[PDB]
């Protein structure tokens, strides 16, 4: 009867942002005060709900979205943001109701000589809809001529890797992000915080 937030926050590896993970949270009780109490989090913003006094509300569903981005891009995990992350990788709706939790993970997700395992989408024909996930790897036609599955010239492979080196400035260091969405559907509410 206890919500499995440890599985998400204290997770060995995180997903690349373009292939962000989503964990369905239900049938459990959660202390968002115990979460807030962790001093690890460099970012803890909430939208439409007060962080404190969250253990009194009950939501039908709770989603825990998690991924890794550049430190400079944490600003983009917010309603109404623009940039490569919000436009092409992870998009929040304007009426987002939930919290955005982020923390520096240079100690875990940086490797000497570069960690290129973490990717992000750099090109897309259009912007993502809110909470849309695009793992396609079609070649992006930036020019007027077709590509036919080859990268050259105005044709680009759409994914690019972060160069996560431990020497990077804080703006180019890896950050782990957890986004909590609170769905209040007209169904049995199964996540509370007594």
């Amino acid at each position, epitope marked *: 009867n206890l919500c499995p937030f440890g599985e998400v926050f204290n997770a060995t590896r995180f997903a690349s942002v373009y292939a962000w993970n989503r964990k369905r949270i239900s049938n459990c009780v959660a202390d968002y005060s115990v979460l807030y109490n962790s001093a690890s989090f460099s970012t803890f913003k909430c939208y439409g709900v007060s962080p404190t006094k969250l253990n009194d509300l009950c939501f039908t569903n709770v989603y825990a979205d998690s991924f890794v981005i550049r430190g400079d891009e944490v600003r983009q995990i917010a309603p109404g943001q623009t940039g490569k992350i919000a436009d092409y990788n992870y998009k929040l709706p304007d009426d987002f109701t939930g919290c955005v939790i982020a923390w520096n993970s240079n100690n875990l997700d940086s490797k000497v000589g570069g960690n290129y395992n973490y990717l992000y989408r750099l090109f897309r024909k259009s912007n993502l809809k809110p909470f849309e996930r695009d793992i396609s790897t079609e070649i992006y036609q*930036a*020019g*007027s*001529t*077709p590509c*036919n599955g080859v990268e*050259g*010239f*105005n*044709c680009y492979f759409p994914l690019q890797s972060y160069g996560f080196q431990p020497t990077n400035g804080v703006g180019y260091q890896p950050y782990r992000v957890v986004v909590l969405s609170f769905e209040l559907l007209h169904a049995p509410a199964t996540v509370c915080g007594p």
Partner: antibody, heavy 119, light 111 residues
């Protein structure tokens, strides 16, 4: 019909620069690329680089990296190529050609421009 | 970024069929079906003849065929005629936004 008209043959002293013009007509300028290919007398063809009149993107092979500059006037429908630090094995005929890019072909060629590097 | 190796010269009797070889590495001819062929008559700009290895732009005779096997592309001229005397160049994508030509082959018609 498709047409590419280049500037006239000229002499250049060693170390000078030359700009070859290439005027396109009969097709949408930005719907294709422009590659430049040169040919030393009695020698084979050498790809010199590409430019997109669409976005201005360019690419040059390492050999000519630094010494060649390709530009595109989208209003005049004209591609220019400029080569500095001219040496005597730069004496060649210089072709501009409509480029299918990853379509895989140089569609139509200009008549060429014979650049002679000589004092 | 190294030149493609074609035979310096090819000859054939009229009405015969000849083939021009074009060899690269795995990184160019082997990787992409992006081989094109060009025909250059003396004192003239080259002419686009073959693309994607085996296709013909509308206007090229049907006796120009394209072949490919491993790291070698091949141009085949059938029903050989006098107008086919020219220099033939092959071209391949080499990765990294780079095109790369062949050494060229001089076609001689025997008579």
């Amino acid at each position: 019909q498709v047409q590419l008209v280049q500037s006239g043959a000229e002499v250049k002293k060693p170390g000078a620069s030359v700009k070859v013009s290439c005027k396109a007509s009969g097709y949408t300028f930005s719907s294709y690329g422009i590659s430049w290919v040169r040919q030393a007398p009695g020698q084979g063809l050498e790809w010199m680089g590409w430019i997109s009149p669409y976005n201005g993107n360019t690419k040059y092979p390492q050999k000519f990296q630094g010494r060649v500059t390709m530009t595109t006037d989208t209003s005049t429908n004209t591609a220019y190529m400029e080569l500095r630090s001219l040496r005597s094995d730069d004496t060649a005929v210089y072709y501009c050609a409509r480029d299918l890019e990853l379509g895989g072909g140089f569609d139509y060629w200009g008549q060429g421009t014979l650049v002679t590097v000589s004092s | 970024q190294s030149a493609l190796t074609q035979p310096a010269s090819v000859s054939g009797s009229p009405g015969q069929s000849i083939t021009i070889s074009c060899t690269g590495t795995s990184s160019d001819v082997g990787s992409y079906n992006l081989v094109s062929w060009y025909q250059q008559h003396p004192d003239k700009a080259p002419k686009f003849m073959i693309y994607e290895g085996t296709k013909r732009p509308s206007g090229v005779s049907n006796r120009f065929s394209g072949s490919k096997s491993g790291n070698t592309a091949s141009l085949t001229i059938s029903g050989l005629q006098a107008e086919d005397e020219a220099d033939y160049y092959c071209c391949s994508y080499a990765g990294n936004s780079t095109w790369v030509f062949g050494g060229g082959t001089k076609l001689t018609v025997l008579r």
